[PDB]
Design an enzyme around this catalytic site. Structure first.
Site, PDB file in Angstrom:
ATOM      1  N   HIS A 286      -1.413  -3.725  -7.328  1.00 32.70           N
ATOM      2  CA  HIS A 286      -2.385  -2.648  -7.390  1.00 32.70           C
ATOM      3  C   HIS A 286      -1.768  -1.263  -7.352  1.00 32.70           C
ATOM      4  CE1 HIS A 286      -2.352  -2.512  -2.851  1.00 32.70           C
ATOM      5  NE2 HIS A 286      -2.599  -1.234  -3.086  1.00 32.70           N
TER       6      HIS A 286
ATOM      7  N   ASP B  25      -7.787  -6.759 -10.379  1.00 34.02           N
ATOM      8  CA  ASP B  25      -8.047  -5.445  -9.824  1.00 34.02           C
ATOM      9  C   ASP B  25      -9.326  -5.373  -8.993  1.00 34.02           C
ATOM     10  OD1 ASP B  25      -9.863  -5.806 -11.845  1.00 34.02           O
ATOM     11  OD2 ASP B  25      -9.320  -4.023 -12.984  1.00 34.02           O
TER      12      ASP B  25
ATOM     13  N   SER C  74       0.860  -0.297   1.462  1.00 34.16           N
ATOM     14  CA  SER C  74       0.706  -1.282   0.396  1.00 34.16           C
ATOM     15  C   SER C  74       2.013  -1.475  -0.359  1.00 34.16           C
ATOM     16  CB  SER C  74      -0.374  -0.830  -0.586  1.00 34.16           C
ATOM     17  OG  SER C  74      -1.608  -0.655   0.084  1.00 34.16           O
ATOM     18  N   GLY C  75       2.327  -2.730  -0.669  1.00 38.09           N
ATOM     19  CA  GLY C  75       3.545  -3.024  -1.406  1.00 38.09           C
ATOM     20  C   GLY C  75       4.708  -3.382  -0.505  1.00 38.09           C
TER      21      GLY C  75
HETATM   22  N1  LIG Z   1      -7.760   3.377  -8.498  1.00 38.71           N
HETATM   23  C1  LIG Z   1      -7.182   3.436  -7.307  1.00 38.71           C
HETATM   24  N2  LIG Z   1      -6.281   4.377  -7.104  1.00 38.71           N
HETATM   25  N3  LIG Z   1      -7.541   2.540  -6.370  1.00 38.71           N
HETATM   26  C2  LIG Z   1      -6.978   2.462  -4.988  1.00 38.71           C
HETATM   27  C3  LIG Z   1      -7.644   1.289  -4.183  1.00 38.71           C
HETATM   28  C4  LIG Z   1      -7.175   0.983  -2.696  1.00 38.71           C
HETATM   29  C5  LIG Z   1      -6.321  -0.308  -2.647  1.00 38.71           C
HETATM   30  C6  LIG Z   1      -5.860  -0.672  -1.206  1.00 38.71           C
HETATM   31  N4  LIG Z   1      -6.251   0.379  -0.231  1.00 38.71           N
HETATM   32  C7  LIG Z   1      -6.907  -0.019   0.950  1.00 38.71           C
HETATM   33  O1  LIG Z   1      -7.173  -1.216   1.156  1.00 38.71           O
HETATM   34  C8  LIG Z   1      -7.359   0.910   2.097  1.00 38.71           C
HETATM   35  C9  LIG Z   1      -6.129   1.194   3.038  1.00 38.71           C
HETATM   36  C10 LIG Z   1      -5.294  -0.021   3.480  1.00 38.71           C
HETATM   37  C11 LIG Z   1      -4.165  -0.444   2.699  1.00 38.71           C
HETATM   38  C12 LIG Z   1      -3.393  -1.564   3.093  1.00 38.71           C
HETATM   39  C13 LIG Z   1      -3.729  -2.278   4.270  1.00 38.71           C
HETATM   40  C14 LIG Z   1      -4.842  -1.883   5.074  1.00 38.71           C
HETATM   41  C15 LIG Z   1      -5.180  -2.648   6.329  1.00 38.71           C
HETATM   42  N5  LIG Z   1      -6.296  -2.395   6.973  1.00 38.71           N
HETATM   43  N6  LIG Z   1      -4.357  -3.560   6.769  1.00 38.71           N
HETATM   44  C16 LIG Z   1      -5.620  -0.754   4.671  1.00 38.71           C
HETATM   45  N7  LIG Z   1      -8.531   0.318   2.687  1.00 38.71           N
HETATM   46  S1  LIG Z   1      -9.954   1.019   2.751  1.00 38.71           S
HETATM   47  O2  LIG Z   1     -10.897   0.094   3.336  1.00 38.71           O
HETATM   48  O3  LIG Z   1      -9.808   2.330   3.376  1.00 38.71           O
HETATM   49  C17 LIG Z   1     -10.313   1.237   1.023  1.00 38.71           C
HETATM   50  C18 LIG Z   1     -10.516   0.122   0.158  1.00 38.71           C
HETATM   51  C19 LIG Z   1     -10.779   0.338  -1.231  1.00 38.71           C
HETATM   52  C20 LIG Z   1     -10.834   1.667  -1.755  1.00 38.71           C
HETATM   53  C21 LIG Z   1     -11.091   1.902  -3.138  1.00 38.71           C
HETATM   54  C22 LIG Z   1     -11.139   3.236  -3.641  1.00 38.71           C
HETATM   55  C23 LIG Z   1     -10.936   4.343  -2.764  1.00 38.71           C
HETATM   56  C24 LIG Z   1     -10.680   4.121  -1.386  1.00 38.71           C
HETATM   57  C25 LIG Z   1     -10.627   2.791  -0.872  1.00 38.71           C
HETATM   58  C26 LIG Z   1     -10.368   2.565   0.498  1.00 38.71           C
HETATM   59  C27 LIG Z   1      -5.911   1.795  -0.544  1.00 38.71           C
HETATM   60  C28 LIG Z   1      -6.360   2.152  -2.024  1.00 38.71           C
END
Ligand SMILES: N=C(N)NCCC1CCN(C(=O)[C@H](Cc2cccc(C(=N)N)c2)NS(=O)(=O)c2ccc3ccccc3c2)CC1
Length: 241
Positions: A42, A91, A191-192
């Site tokens: 992603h 996605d 992430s990653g």
């Molecule tokens: N087109 C795009 N650029 N899309 C980006 C999508 C999204 C993928 C993974 N991310 C997250 O899951 C975050 C933060 C996160 C990352 C890794 C691990 C954890 C954890 N809790 N262990 C949390 N979680 S969230 O619930 O705040 C959220 C979910 C989906 C979203 C979509 C669009 C905008 C904001 C978002 C926030 C960040 C971005």
């Protein structure tokens, strides 16, 4: 990483930082060989304003500790020659959220740059085992990223419980790791990155890829990670590793 502490310099020599042309740190990755890194698919999806799927748009920093000190001794800078997203990556559900990143030039092994060991297809990281998540991501949900690499201890959660906590969202490629009480968890920007698991002889194996979560460190919303053993053959077939 939420609820973590500063890592010691060079404590996670396999942790890599990926910067997008003019945007700074975007995602983490792990070094698995001189020429390859493992990350989350992603992170490399084009959007209307930027071609994240274009390898030439990235810079990987290996041996990095502090984001504000990217030239420090031992830090290696490398460009990407190619990005291989898993063909089944979705996605929408985030299923098969894993990618292979080929370095333009080989990493130089040092005390600060070293690959993480990859687990065999048949290996199982048991529910309850302590695992380490590392990253420069947010230290608070809705907060800001860390300058100094953070580390946090979390635990593998039973798959059934995982599925029940996040209904209609957990596939067998995913694994919950953290705590039902929250507190410690990965977050935006992590992430990653790799899950580091200390095994029988002290050596560290990758137990997963930081993928997604409902918020960060929330109660009953542990982080969701892409499993590694399931992709051993895929990695071998695509990288020779
Ligand atoms: N087109 C795009 N650029 N899309 C980006 C999508 C999204 C993928 C993974 N991310 C997250 O899951 C975050 C933060 C996160 C990352 C890794 C691990 C954890 C954890 N809790 N262990 C949390 N979680 S969230 O619930 O705040 C959220 C979910 C989906 C979203 C979509 C669009 C905008 C904001 C978002 C926030 C960040 C971005």
């Amino acid at each position: 990483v939420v609820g973590g502490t500063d890592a010691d310099e060079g404590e996670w020599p396999w942790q890599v930082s990926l910067h997008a042309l003019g945007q700074g740190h975007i995602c983490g990755a792990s070094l698995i060989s001189p020429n390859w890194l493992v990350s989350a698919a992603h992170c490399y999806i084009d959007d209307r304003g930027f071609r994240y799927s274009d390898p030439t748009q990235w810079t990987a920093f290996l041996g990095l500790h502090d984001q504000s000190q990217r030239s420090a001794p031992g830090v290696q800078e490398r460009r990407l020659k190619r990005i291989i997203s898993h063909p089944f990556f979705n996605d929408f559900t985030f299923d098969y959220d894993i990618a292979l990143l080929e370095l333009e030039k080989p990493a130089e092994y040092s005390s600060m740059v070293r690959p993480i060991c990859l687990p065999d297809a048949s290996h199982v990281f048991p529910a309850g085992k302590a695992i380490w998540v590392t990253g420069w991501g947010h230290t608070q949900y809705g907060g800001t990223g860390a300058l100094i690499l953070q580390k946090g201890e979390i635990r593998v959660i039973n798959q059934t419980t995982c599925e029940n906590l996040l209904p209609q969202q957990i596939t067998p490629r995913m694994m919950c790791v953290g705590f039902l009480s929250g507190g410690v968890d990965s977050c935006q920007g992590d992430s990653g990155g790799p899950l580091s698991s200390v095994e029988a002889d002290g050596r560290i194996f990758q137990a997963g890829v930081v993928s997604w979560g409902d918020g960060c460190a929330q109660r009953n919303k542990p982080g969701v990670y892409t499993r590694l053993p399931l992709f051993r053959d895929w990695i071998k077939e695509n990288t020779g590793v």
